[PDB]
Design a protein around this ligand. Sequence first.
Ligand SMILES: [Mg+2]
Length: 208
Amino acid sequence: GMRVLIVEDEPYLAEAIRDGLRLEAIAADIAGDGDTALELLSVNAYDIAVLDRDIPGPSGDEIAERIVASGSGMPILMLTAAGADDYLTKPFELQELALRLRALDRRRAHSRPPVREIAGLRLDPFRREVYRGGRYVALTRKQFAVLEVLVAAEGGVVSAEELLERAWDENADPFTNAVRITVSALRKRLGEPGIIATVPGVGYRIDT
Ligand SMILES: [Mg+2]
C-alpha cells in the first residue's frame, strides 16, 4: 500500500491523522518538527509528504523546497490554518484527506521513484551523502551531481554531454573534459572495485 510522511506539531494530531489512515491501507511515519522530517527523508522512501506549514525547526515550506530540489517528484500536500500540489485547511474530514492522497498517488501510479541504490551504493540527496556498502564516501558537490545522474540511470549509459547539461548548466558551453576529469575523480573517491564503466563512444554507466 501507500507510505506517507506526516509532519504536524499540534499535540496528538500527527498521531491521530496516522491513526485515521491505518485502516485505509495507508501507512505513515510521523514527525513533529522539520529536523525530524528531514532525518526521516534521508532514510525512508515515501509516496507522499503531508506537511504542516508552521512547525518547529525548518518550516513546512522549507521541507517542501528540499523535496522539490531532490528531483524525486514526490507529491506534497500542505496543511494550513487559513511549490505544492495541493493544500488542505485544518480541521478537515479524514475521507477528504484520503481522497487527496489517493488522487495525488494515482496521477503518477506507473512512474517509478528515483533509483538511489545500486551495486552497493546508497545515495541520499537530503544530506548529500554517498555510502558504499555502508561506508561513507565524501564527495564534492559536482561529484555528487554526476553520480546522482548515473545512479538514477540504473546501469544505463549517460553521455558526457548529458552529464554537462544536468550537472553544470542546461545551456552550457559543450566542453566535456571537465566532465571526464570529474568522473575520473569520482572513480578515485569511490575506490575498488570499479563501479563506473566507460562505454568508449557513448558515455558512462554504473557497472552491474
Ligand atoms: Mg503547526
